[PDB]
């Protein structure tokens, strides 16, 4: 298992514009297009992202290319963020994937906001961090995915994904 396989399980794959769990226009492997309510504003973002007139539909290669970009952006955002970088540096390989996952879903700013849990991760207080991560809107809104990520933090293995 690796980051790509982990995120592909969490986000799934869709080749037509769809709405995410929050109601936002998305496509591919969890590629957020816009928070705007307009499907047209969504098709404009999509065409711009792909570089062609898509009419709201893309191919598998195009989905995977957006995904590759997004994973890279998640990682680079972590390494550039003063609050996240130190946590990342501190973790083992498996747990690093879990933080990338949270960032991919919620954005760097959002994760950076989990101040207390970040401190517990850095201190390697696994059980405590897991409990603290669960007291969140994130956990309450997407509980099965949050549990999977939390378990990865708690154990440092890919069991939740196997
Ligand atoms: Cl893009
Ligand atoms: Cl879920």
Curated annotation (Swiss-Prot):
Substrate binds at residues 32, 104, 117, 132. Changing residue 117 to I: 500-fold decrease in enzymatic activity. One of its GO terms (cellular component) is host cell cytoplasm. It is found in: Host cytoplasm. It holds the Pfam family Phage_lysozyme. Endolysin with lysozyme activity that degrades host peptidoglycans and participates with the holin and spanin proteins in the sequential events which lead to the programmed host cell lysis releasing the mature viral particles. Once the holin has permeabilized the host cell membrane, the endolysin can reach the periplasm and break down the peptidoglycan layer. This is Endolysin. It comes from Enterobacteria phage T4. The lineage of its organism: Viruses, Duplodnaviria, Heunggongvirae, Uroviricota, Caudoviricetes. The gene is E.
